[PDB]
Amino acid sequence: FRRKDLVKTMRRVDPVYIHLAERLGTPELSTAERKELENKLKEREEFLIPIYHQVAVQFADLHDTPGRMQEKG
């Protein structure tokens, strides 16, 4: 669950990053607007790394529970 996959997760969760990513998907807005959107996306995705990192390790923790050990025997 390295950074690349973390970003892929953020792509479908964070409303701000979603709004920016959808806006940048519009064809031929303007050069300046695309540059601004790209910088906003970079800043938002970088800013959200530690929180989604904690989420990731929580996700992995759900694999190490005794319920799984009981199901597997």
Next chain:
Amino acid sequence: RITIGNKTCVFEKENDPSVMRSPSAGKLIQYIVEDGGHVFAGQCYAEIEVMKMVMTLTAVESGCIHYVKRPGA
């Protein structure tokens, strides 16, 4: 204090911006006080671990602290 021949010139070592800095490498575990809370000099504001041995962090100046790094870093 720099002496050149028989003349003296004094240079200041910057410590002015009042930014709290980690004295060492390591990992941040948690912060002790609230983001935006007032701290007094000598009060511990953060808990970090290097060496697998925990070391706190005392504030130098009294003021209102805002954190840059998120807990776990």
